[PDB]
Design an enzyme around this catalytic site. Structure first.
Site, PDB file in Angstrom:
ATOM      1  N   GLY A 135       1.490   2.800  10.131  1.00 51.42           N
ATOM      2  CA  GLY A 135       0.778   3.908   9.551  1.00 51.42           C
ATOM      3  C   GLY A 135      -0.716   3.667   9.611  1.00 51.42           C
ATOM      4  N   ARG A 136      -1.485   4.464   8.861  1.00 49.10           N
ATOM      5  CA  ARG A 136      -2.973   4.460   8.855  1.00 49.10           C
ATOM      6  C   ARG A 136      -3.472   4.543   7.408  1.00 49.10           C
TER       7      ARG A 136
ATOM      8  N   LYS B 132      -7.576   5.079   5.082  1.00 54.44           N
ATOM      9  CA  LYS B 132      -8.984   5.545   5.173  1.00 54.44           C
ATOM     10  C   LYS B 132      -9.767   4.566   6.060  1.00 54.44           C
TER      11      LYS B 132
ATOM     12  N   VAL C  69      -2.321   0.062  10.523  1.00 52.13           N
ATOM     13  CA  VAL C  69      -1.423  -0.980   9.933  1.00 52.13           C
ATOM     14  C   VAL C  69      -0.231  -1.193  10.842  1.00 52.13           C
ATOM     15  CG1 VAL C  69      -0.083  -1.616   7.873  1.00 52.13           C
ATOM     16  CG2 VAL C  69      -2.185  -0.293   7.616  1.00 52.13           C
TER      17      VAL C  69
ATOM     18  N   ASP D 102      -7.280   1.853  -7.651  1.00 48.26           N
ATOM     19  CA  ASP D 102      -6.547   2.715  -6.704  1.00 48.26           C
ATOM     20  C   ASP D 102      -5.055   2.592  -6.938  1.00 48.26           C
ATOM     21  OD1 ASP D 102      -6.446   4.604  -4.543  1.00 48.26           O
ATOM     22  OD2 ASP D 102      -6.483   3.023  -3.012  1.00 48.26           O
TER      23      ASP D 102
HETATM   24  C1  QBE Z   1      -1.852  -3.665   4.364  1.00 49.53           C
HETATM   25  C2  QBE Z   1      -2.626  -2.373   4.475  1.00 49.53           C
HETATM   26  C3  QBE Z   1      -2.934  -1.763   3.132  1.00 49.53           C
HETATM   27  O1  QBE Z   1      -3.593  -2.355   2.276  1.00 49.53           O
HETATM   28  N1  QBE Z   1      -2.432  -0.520   2.957  1.00 49.53           N
HETATM   29  C4  QBE Z   1      -1.465   0.176   3.716  1.00 49.53           C
HETATM   30  C5  QBE Z   1      -0.187  -0.356   3.885  1.00 49.53           C
HETATM   31  C6  QBE Z   1       0.770   0.345   4.615  1.00 49.53           C
HETATM   32  N2  QBE Z   1       2.117  -0.073   4.730  1.00 49.53           N
HETATM   33  C7  QBE Z   1       2.772  -1.212   4.320  1.00 49.53           C
HETATM   34  C8  QBE Z   1       4.171  -1.334   4.533  1.00 49.53           C
HETATM   35  C9  QBE Z   1       4.843  -2.486   4.189  1.00 49.53           C
HETATM   36  N3  QBE Z   1       6.182  -2.679   4.311  1.00 49.53           N
HETATM   37  C10 QBE Z   1       7.039  -1.620   4.849  1.00 49.53           C
HETATM   38  C11 QBE Z   1       7.290  -1.582   6.309  1.00 49.53           C
HETATM   39  C12 QBE Z   1       8.376  -1.981   5.375  1.00 49.53           C
HETATM   40  N4  QBE Z   1       4.049  -3.472   3.658  1.00 49.53           N
HETATM   41  N5  QBE Z   1       4.512  -4.692   3.226  1.00 49.53           N
HETATM   42  C13 QBE Z   1       3.431  -5.288   2.747  1.00 49.53           C
HETATM   43  C14 QBE Z   1       2.272  -4.502   2.861  1.00 49.53           C
HETATM   44  C15 QBE Z   1       0.943  -4.822   2.440  1.00 49.53           C
HETATM   45  N6  QBE Z   1      -0.102  -5.130   2.083  1.00 49.53           N
HETATM   46  C16 QBE Z   1       2.689  -3.319   3.459  1.00 49.53           C
HETATM   47  N7  QBE Z   1       2.033  -2.186   3.790  1.00 49.53           N
HETATM   48  C17 QBE Z   1       0.436   1.567   5.184  1.00 49.53           C
HETATM   49  C18 QBE Z   1      -0.833   2.087   5.014  1.00 49.53           C
HETATM   50  C19 QBE Z   1      -1.809   1.416   4.280  1.00 49.53           C
HETATM   51  C20 QBE Z   1      -3.177   2.023   4.097  1.00 49.53           C
END
Ligand code: QBE
Length: 327
Positions: free
Chosen positions: A44-45, A47, A51, A151
């Site tokens: 995903g994305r 701001k 990711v 947030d």
């Molecule tokens: C790491 C990026 C962040 O700070 N935010 C973020 C996370 C994300 N998705 C995610 C998604 C997952 N796990 C899902 C796939 C099974 N995880 N697992 C750990 C983390 C972390 N940290 C995580 N972030 C999608 C969009 C944004 C903006």
């Protein structure tokens, strides 16, 4: 001008720490080796990022990589320093690595998350209490460590439901609390913005997070996402006022001598404080208790100083069953 404010709790935690703890502008980033990770798929994305799921080929661990869009070095240093300061704390995401290649990328612990808009719908009364308690442990910890998340919202709470595992993520907007500091009010997603942000009161604190948490709780127990559905930042305060009432809003404004934007004058109107009973229905009634409503009422206050602390919230009757079970 406006009356000053101080956090009721953890007021001077940073003042007592060595300068380097909070002086993130001075932080020198420890870079790892980019070649240790191979990207697997786009997740995903954000701001400020794109990711990915990746693999550490050093040890075959699944990892999440946040590749940063262009941001000032001090904002990246702030997020890194906060993640390092909080590392090991209850339900705080682990920052595993920081790599460059000249884009910088943060490497996190992977949480096997169940879809936000598919998990919440299955949650029981117990589940909501349990996960709320887990979020409160992360917030009490970060607040006690002198950090506001700023947030808190569903997207930033990863839940691996099978393992009853929760992590608070995305510390990109978090900041150190210093008494007297005037903070940026342009923080948080619309629906979760505290009244302090919406009226442009800059001298806010940890209590911001508690408003956001209350918004989450309301959305979960009432099956109403978002709870406060504003059209814009101005209308967001109107939506809050239609529930909490305008008498308490104007009392808050008076107490802090806040200068209310003139835009507001013709839109806030006059509203009674509503009973929480008007959001209960046959579909959500199984989630709603006197305890839940009492707790929610004590988070959703205009006056940041009157909201429950994280540690007070954890002692509320809503959690008595959870606390007993964790033994
Ligand atoms: C790491 C990026 C962040 O700070 N935010 C973020 C996370 C994300 N998705 C995610 C998604 C997952 N796990 C899902 C796939 C099974 N995880 N697992 C750990 C983390 C972390 N940290 C995580 N972030 C999608 C969009 C944004 C903006």
């Amino acid at each position: 001008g406006p009356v000053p404010s101080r956090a009721r709790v953890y007021t001077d935690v940073n003042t007592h720490r060595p300068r380097e703890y909070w002086d993130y502008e001075s932080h020198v980033v420890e870079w790892g080796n980019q070649d240790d990770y191979q990207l697997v798929r786009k997740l995903g994305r954000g701001k400020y990022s794109e990711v990915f799921e990746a693999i550490n080929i050093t040890n075959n661990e699944k990892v999440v990589v946040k590749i940063l869009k262009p941001v000032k070095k001090k904002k990246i240093k702030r997020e890194i320093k906060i993640l390092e300061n909080l590392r090991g704390g209850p339900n705080i995401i682990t920052l595993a690595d920081i790599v460059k290649d000249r884009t910088p990328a943060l490497v996190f612990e992977h949480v096997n998350n169940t879809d936000f808009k598919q998990l919440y719908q299955t949650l029981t009364d117990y589940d909501i209490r349990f996960y709320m308690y887990e979020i409160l442990k992360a917030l009490d910890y970060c607040h006690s460590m002198g950090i506001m998340h700023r947030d808190v919202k569903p997207h930033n709470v990863m839940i691996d439901h099978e393992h009853r595992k929760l992590r608070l993520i995305d510390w990109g907007l978090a900041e150190f609390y210093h008494p007297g500091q005037e903070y940026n009010v342009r923080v948080a997603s619309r629906y979760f913005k505290g009244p302090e942000l919406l009226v442009d009161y800059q001298m806010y604190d940890y209590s911001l997070d508690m408003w956001s948490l209350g918004c989450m709780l309301a959305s979960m127990i009432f099956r109403k996402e978002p709870f406060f559905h504003g059209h814009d930042n101005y209308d967001q305060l109107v939506r809050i006022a239609k529930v909490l009432g305008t008498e308490d809003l104007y009392d808050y404004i008076d107490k802090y001598n806040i200068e209310l934007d003139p835009r507001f004058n013709d839109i806030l109107g006059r509203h009674s404080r509503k009973r929480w009973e008007r959001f209960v229905h046959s579909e959500n009634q199984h989630l709603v208790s006197p305890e839940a409503l009492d707790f929610l009422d004590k988070l959703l206050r205009y006056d940041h100083q009157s909201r429950l602390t994280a540690r007070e919230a954890m002692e509320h009757p809503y959690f008595y069953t959870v606390v007993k079970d964790q033994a």
